[PDB]
Write a protein that binds this ligand. Structure first.
Ligand code: MET
Length: 521
């Protein structure tokens, strides 16, 4: 039977553009989702904009527009960037939605009646040296407007009631769940620092003015953005189930759920997804996630992204100059099971993509297709010129799937390009361009280029989750139904091809520099 898989990515904040560092997470997630879809599994990919908090109030104020105005414009822009980068969500919702308002309040109310909510007064005191108000830890709250000394009648001591999630109530459960396999060992041991220290109650309320959901029965008190943000996951899925009759909420979020749930996140936000989130789900009556998939961050030419050096590239700025599949492949070629950083070496970016994709994959196709087109009216002739070469492709497939399954895209691209390298070399060894000029060798020409195109179909199957647009164009040329992973098991013989679709041009280094220049501020 197929696997039911609900996959999410972190919800970007609704206060700025998506940049190429953010894009690494969504490309990682989308590629994994597309692979599971090819494998015949029910993989559902949901995300949303994170539209609350002082983060949004600051930008809304900085631009003289309302908070609703900003997040609406921003959600449109984020969805356009993701879509153009071929990141295909099943739903892209918003933490500022009626589903999130009800889910947050229903979860809160259940947790409260179970005794997992606490009320205590937080004190803030003015520090004359640091010249600002500090919180009573026993840091300051994030500012909501743009803005000190001890004034005569001005208080030096604020106080306000806050609402706490009694996270320590789940410490035993969390001590077990964090080491259950849901986290990679590196992740679990870095996270366990909070556990070694002892969990603390979590401040989930903010005072007015705050752009967010109001807390039931606490007038003037709002949920902190990080309280409702992960509930955006459930909200995004609940909103989707209204339009997808085959998707049942309880089937994915009930404690009994036999479905898998994965959160792709960056390493900076593990504590929210690994401590508060699974405690919240268990206390509220839902299943905990199957695993967190944690990733590192992006560097460009060996250094941190620089707005001054022009290596802090907006997704739209990339898309103005370059094919998105360039970057999708480059990321795939370095994305690993680990949690390390990933470097975009711009010179290596051009050499690697041109040599691997255009050179080893696209050119095997266009060269061979031309001979089938001109020499046999476009009918691919079936033959067995190089059985050992073909068997290698068969032997390699389940391993490439294992890499995909385990998020080891690096290994997967490696295995694929090794097959590409070997197939390409055999074609060159045959030299159909030379056989085509010899009289009485036309059968040989079609035998060779038939295998060539067959192997290109195999490479497209293997690369489809990285290059879904290229795959679509390839399926048009190959004149086949959309490719499943199981299609690798069959071959085209005696098959009418369509005209050759353009698949990918080389990366022009001028365009890469034009992208960097456009990003210098
Ligand atoms: C529920 S995931 C929230 C992610 C958060 N908005 C961030 O950008 O770090």
């Amino acid at each position: 039977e197929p696997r039911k898989i609900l996959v999410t990515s972190a919800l970007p904040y609704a206060n700025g553009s998506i940049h190429l560092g953010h894009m690494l997470e969504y490309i990682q997630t989308d590629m994994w989702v597309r692979f599971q879809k090819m494998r015949g599994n029910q993989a559902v990919y949901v995300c949303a904009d994170d539209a609350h908090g002082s983060a949004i109030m600051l930008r809304a104020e900085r631009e003289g527009i309302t908070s609703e105005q900003l997040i609406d414009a921003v959600r449109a822009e984020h969805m356009g960037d993701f879509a153009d980068f071929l990141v295909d969500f099943d739903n892209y919702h918003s933490t500022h939605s009626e589903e999130n308002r009800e889910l947050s309040s229903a979860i809160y109310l259940k947790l409260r009646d179970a005794g997992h909510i606490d009320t205590r007064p937080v004190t803030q005191y003015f520090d004359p040296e640091k010249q600002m108000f500090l919180a009573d830890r026993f840091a300051t709250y994030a500012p909501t407007e743009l803005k000190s000394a001890i004034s005569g009648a001005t208080p030096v001591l604020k106080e306000s009631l806050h609402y706490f999630f009694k996270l320590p109530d789940f410490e035993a459960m969390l001590k077990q769940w964090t080491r259950s396999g849901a986290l990679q060992e590196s992740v679990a041991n870095k996270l366990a620092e909070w556990l070694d220290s002892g969990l603390q109650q979590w401040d989930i309320s903010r005072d007015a003015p705050y752009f967010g959901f109001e807390i039931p029965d606490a007038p003037g008190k709002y949920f902190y953005v990080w309280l409702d943000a992960p509930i955006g996951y459930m909200a995004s899925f609940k909103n989707l189930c209204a339009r997808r009759p085959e998707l049942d909420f309880d089937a994915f979020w009930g404690k009994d759920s036999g479905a898998e749930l994965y959160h792709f996140i960056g390493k900076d936000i593990v504590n929210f997804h690994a401590l508060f989130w699974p405690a919240m789900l268990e206390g509220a009556g839902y299943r905990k996630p199957t695993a967190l998939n944690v990733h590192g961050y992006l560097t460009v030419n060996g250094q941190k992204m620089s707005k001054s050096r022009g290596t802090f590239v907006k997704a739209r700025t990339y898309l103005d100059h370059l094919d998105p599949e360039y970057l999708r492949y480059y990321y795939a070629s370095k994305l690993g099971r680990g949690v390390e950083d990933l470097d975009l070496n711009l010179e290596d970016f051009v050499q690697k993509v041109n040599s691997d994709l255009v050179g080893k994959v696209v050119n095997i196709a266009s060269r061979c297709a031309g001979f089938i087109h001109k020499g046999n009216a476009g009918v691919l002739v079936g033959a067995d010129p190089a059985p050992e070469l073909l068997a290698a492709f068969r032997e390699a497939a389940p391993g490439i799937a294992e890499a995909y399954e385990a998020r080891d895209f690096n290994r997967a691209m490696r295995e694929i390009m090794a097959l590409a390298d070997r197939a390409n070399a055999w074609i060159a060894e045959q030299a159909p361009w030379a056989l085509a000029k010899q009289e009485g060798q036309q059968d040989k020409v079609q035998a060779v280029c038939g295998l060539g195109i067959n192997l290109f179909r195999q490479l497209v199957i293997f690369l489809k989750p990285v290059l879904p647009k290229l795959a679509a164009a390839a399926e048009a040329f190959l004149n086949v139904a959309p490719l499943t992973w199981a299609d690798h098991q069959t071959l085209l013989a005696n098959h009418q091809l369509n005209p050759f679709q353009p698949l990918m041009t080389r990366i022009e280094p001028a365009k890469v520099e034009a992208m960097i220049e456009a990003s210098k501020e």
